[PDB]
Amino acid sequence: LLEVPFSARGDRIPDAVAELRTREPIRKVRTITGAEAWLVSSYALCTQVLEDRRFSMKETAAAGAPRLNALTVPPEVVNNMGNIADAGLRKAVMKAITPKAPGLEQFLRDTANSLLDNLITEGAPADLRNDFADPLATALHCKVLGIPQEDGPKLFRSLSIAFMSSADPIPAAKINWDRDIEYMAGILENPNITTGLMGELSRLRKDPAYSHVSDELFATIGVTFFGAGVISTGSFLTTALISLIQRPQLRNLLHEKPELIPAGVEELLRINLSFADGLPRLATADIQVGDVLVRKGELVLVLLEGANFDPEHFPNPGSIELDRPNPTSHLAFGRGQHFCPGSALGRRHAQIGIEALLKKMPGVDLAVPIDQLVWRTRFQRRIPERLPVLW
Ligand code: HEM
Ligand SMILES: C=C[C@H](c1ccc(-c2ccc(O)c(Cl)c2)cc1)n1ccnc1
Structure with a gap:
């Protein structure tokens, strides 16, 4: 039985995706746990699944369900946004x-420029993941949360385990989760934390209109939004920079006409291969999806690059075109009830990061042949372990 995922490489889409999409846009597959699942790979069927709440994110955490991979958080946290909504906190x-937020964008720009100046001073080769994109993501999310910048690196170092895609429970994930929760709980008790997400949660925690909300949920919001935001923005920016480097004509155009960077980033979102697995959902009813009657209790995997490279919806899907008629209609941020709450922040992180890099390093190019990039395996994102560049 066809195994997923197909490839950890984030620099090219496997030819097999287009064949599946054409012939079998919903197809039975086996996940790393040995579970069976339905892999959905066309724009039409991916949107159908994501827009039908009977394909449930929450129920993927149920004991005994077929699993894509092992939980790395407590099962109730899989329903985190529903818990936030129910608590009145959305x-x-x-x-x-x-x-x-006032001053946030300038902070992003200043941070990006400082990171780049340090790379220039040190001399090529530079590692654009570990010494640019990920520190920029980490600094951004410390600022957004209202927590000390110097706490960023230790929180960041949880994430190489937190976002694993493992067949089995991960003992280090429990250690890191519990430690990071204790940190966020202490932040909520820290009177000096008055800005950002944690400053606001700290105020609401003392407000009688929210007296019922648990300390557990408040801390969980901090851990989950830091982790999701940092891993997603750092990983997206890294692999978008590869796509841009691979396209010198586009790199030069965006350097010459930086007002096109938002349109460029939207296409880089569309062609991004950062999500390593389909988005999992558990059927809570028998539901017809294409030629398949998905049965209650079965696992469905929504393959984002299936949708986003679907030529029926995005003609010439492998080409970056800055004037498409349907440019934000990609699924890079999902669709439906669980649409990414951080989408605007993720866009802005990448726009500013790319703006800054192109100004400082207009000649940026890979410093190694692209096949020498080392793609992280058994992880929820596709990322190169290092991104060595020269300029
Ligand atoms: C370019 C950056 C990002 C990308 C590509 C991205 C992608 C996604 C996708 C595809 C989903 C849907 C998951 C699903 O339906 O199963 C999602 C959800 C989520 N994202 Fe993002 N994201 C990004 C940035 C962020 C940021 C900056 C934050 C927070 C600061 C964030 C926090 C979350 C959370 C908490 C959820 C879960 C929502 C829910 O369950 O309803 N993400 N993201
Ligand atoms: C399913 C939830 C997922 C998520 C997964 C793991 C973490 C995490 C963070 C720090 C840690 O130390 C550990 Cl161990 C885990 C956070 C969030 N997610 C994605 C978007 N929203 C939520």
């Missing part, structure tokens, strides 16, 4: 993580 969380 609006406050969203307001806290907007890129338009």
Whole structure:
């Protein structure tokens, strides 16, 4: 039985995806746990699954369910956004993580420029993942959360385990989770934390309108939004920089006309291979998806690059075109009930990071042949362990 995932490489889509999409856009596969699942790979069927709440994220955590991979958080945290919504916290969380917070964008620009100046001083080769994209993501999320910048690196170092895609429970994930929760709980008790997401959660925790909300949920919001935001923005920016480096004509165009960078980033989102696995959902009813009657209790995997390279929806899907008529209609941020709450922040992180890099390093190029990149395995993102560049 066809095994998923197909390839940990984030620099090229396997030819097999287009064949599946054409012939079998919903197809039985085996996951790393040995479970069977339905892999959905067309824009039409991916959108159908993501927009039908009977394909449940929450129920993927149920004991005894077929699993894509092992939990790395407590099972109730899989329903984190539902818990946030039920607690009356959605609006406050969203307001806290907007890129338009006063001074946030300038902080992003200043941080990016400082990171780049240090790389220039040290001399090529430079590692754009470990010494640019990931520190930029980490610094951004410390600022957004309102926590000390110097605490970023230790929180960041949880994530190479936190976002593993493992067949089995990971003992280090429990250690790191418990430690990171204790940290966020202490932050909520720290009177000096008055800004950002944790400053606002700290205030709401003392507000009688929220007296019922548990300390557990407040700390969980901090751990989950830091982890999801840092891994997603650092990994997306890293692999978008590869796509851009691979396209010198586009790199030069965006350097010459940086007002096109938002359109460029939107296409880089569309062609991004950062998510290593399909998005998992558990059927809570018998539901017809294409030619397959998915049965209650079965696992469905929504393959984002299946949708995003679907030529019916995005003609010439492998080409970056800055004037498509349907440019934000990709699924890079998901779709439906679980659409990424951080989407605007993720866009802005990448836009500013790329703007800064192109100004400082207009000649940026890989310093090794592209096949020498080392792609992280058994992880929820596809990323190169190092991204060596020259300029
Ligand atoms: C370019 C950057 C990002 C990408 C590509 C991305 C991608 C995604 C995708 C595809 C989903 C849907 C998962 C699903 O439906 O199963 C998602 C959800 C989520 N994202 Fe993002 N994300 C990014 C940035 C962020 C940021 C900056 C934050 C927070 C600061 C964040 C926090 C979350 C959370 C908490 C969820 C879960 C939502 C829910 O369960 O309803 N993400 N993200
Ligand atoms: C399913 C939840 C997933 C998520 C997974 C793992 C973590 C995590 C963070 C720090 C840790 O120390 C450990 Cl061990 C785990 C956080 C979040 N997620 C993705 C978007 N929203 C939530």
